[PDB]
């Protein structure tokens, strides 16, 4: 039970490192290199 929660949360935390097809997996990097017009396209993938 403890292991199941730990691995489930661990998998969830590690998912933040996936770009999901975006240029980068860090929202700060996207906002710090791309202006809003095309930033949504990269960002929208991250939310999904």
């Amino acid at each position: 039970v403890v292991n199941q929660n730990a691995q489930a949360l661990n998998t969830l935390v590690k998912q933040l490192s996936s770009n999901f097809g975006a240029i980068s997996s860090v929202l700060n990097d996207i906002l710090s290199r791309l202006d809003p017009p095309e930033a949504e396209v990269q960002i929208d993938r991250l939310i999904t």
Partner: protein, 48 residues
């Protein structure tokens, strides 16, 4: 701010954001091509 460059379109990062990061390592490639082939120089575009 110079009219000399009549075609300045960046791909991976917005041009306005260039003044927000200091690089220390940039590869600059210079060469001369026919005007009609200027569009051919792009990421993953077929052409001669």
């Amino acid at each position: 701010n110079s009219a000399s460059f009549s075609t300045f379109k960046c791909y991976g990062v917005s041009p306005t954001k260039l003044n927000d990061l200091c690089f220390t390592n940039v590869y600059a490639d210079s060469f001369v091509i026919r005007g009609d082939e200027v569009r051919q120089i792009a990421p993953g575009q077929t052409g001669k």
